[PDB]
Amino acid sequence: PLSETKCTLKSFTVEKGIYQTSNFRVQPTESIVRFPNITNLCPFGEVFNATKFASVYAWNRKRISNCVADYSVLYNSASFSTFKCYGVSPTKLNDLCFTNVYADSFVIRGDEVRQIAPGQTGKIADYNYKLPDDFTGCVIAWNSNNLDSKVGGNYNYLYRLFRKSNLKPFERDISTEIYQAGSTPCNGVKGFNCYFPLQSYGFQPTYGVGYQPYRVVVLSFELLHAPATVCGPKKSTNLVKNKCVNFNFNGLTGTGVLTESNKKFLPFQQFGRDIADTTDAVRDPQTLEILDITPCSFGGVSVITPGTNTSNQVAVLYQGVNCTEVPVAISNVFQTRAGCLIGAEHVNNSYECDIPIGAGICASYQT
Amino acid sequence: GKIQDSLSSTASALGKLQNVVNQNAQALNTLVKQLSSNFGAISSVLNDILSRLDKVEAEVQIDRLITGRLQSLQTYVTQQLIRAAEIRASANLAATKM
């Protein structure tokens, strides 16, 4: 502490006074992760090996829940072409719990993959399929001229060619009503300025690179507003209470001491918060008790020293910290309302204040 | 005895002192509330972005938090100085009355 106060006062000699330093913290003793008792595997195998992908104008969305997922295989697989994430880190998918999982299946021209990204533009991104501005997830695509494209022409992958207005994120339309693009109103099934809203991809193995069909999968999910349903391949470890640990509940990281909670959580409630709007109570995914959360004590470290020439002995104060914390060095310990004190000899007989301490305590140098 | 009753009469007779403690609580409550805001970022939990994004993509997102959060302290701390100066002037007035 003498060297610390010298460093923080920027001098090789410090006057007789009390100076703050870097605040005390309790390091986490260990790391614990809490995940639900889920073991069945997510159907990503069938999602990414589905034989038939729906036409983009009628793109198929499939929900995936209550399963165990491993996106590392998809990330490391060289069979894929463009795995671009927008809201999360691709390697960080595998240590997070997701509330809901969307699988979007549709095949576009390879030159049109760039338009799938959030905030893009184009006829496909307008009235075939689109993403919101705040898309959370990743996009993955790969060429499929080997199977989807046919020598006679894979024209079955239809798509909308006309639309009155740009639709909304995650919105689909199926009706093939004749478009009245022209000034005159129209009906029937054909006519000038009466155009069918659909036109079809022409896919053959003979076409050059970029024009071939790409099997595109878009992954959408939301974090921290709903109970976890899909979790990563992390393995749960035994819970440790009332100790400073690097806890992890369904991806909700933190640092503090975990204690049993007397707050009555309704079955649908799992995340508890305070007037500060920050997590303070979580229901363990393994067993349904309520665990109070509190960061274990941190306080200022106010060195109490006399003049450097007068002495080198120093008394270390921990502001607002109960003595049931750090030991000695870095049999003589005192407790004050202002915090715990180390390196001083508490006495009963009183004198005038020399170094203010807190809650009416004052230090002095004497035999 | 009237001082006994006048003090006992209304609970708002100590408004000159009550407003002081209220305001620091108000400023702190306002300062604490700021941590719940996003400042344009994808979230408001500094631990979330660290787990949600990699080293090279999150480094700009925490920069969004670090601007607003730090700027709040400037607004909070400065607003504490003027109040501190206000009290200091009042204390000197009290000392003269003392």
């Binding site: 607002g320 809650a359 009416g360 | 941590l35």
Partner: peptide, 28 residues
């Protein structure tokens, strides 16, 4: 809890009460 701390004042409620008693004692 998030770095917010309240450090107790150096003078305790008892001493300042004694100060006021001392101030009043000399006054009367």
């Amino acid at each position: 809890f998030n770095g917010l701390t309240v450090l107790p004042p150096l003078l305790t409620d008892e001493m300042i009460a004694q100060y006021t008693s001392a101030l009043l004692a000399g006054t009367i």
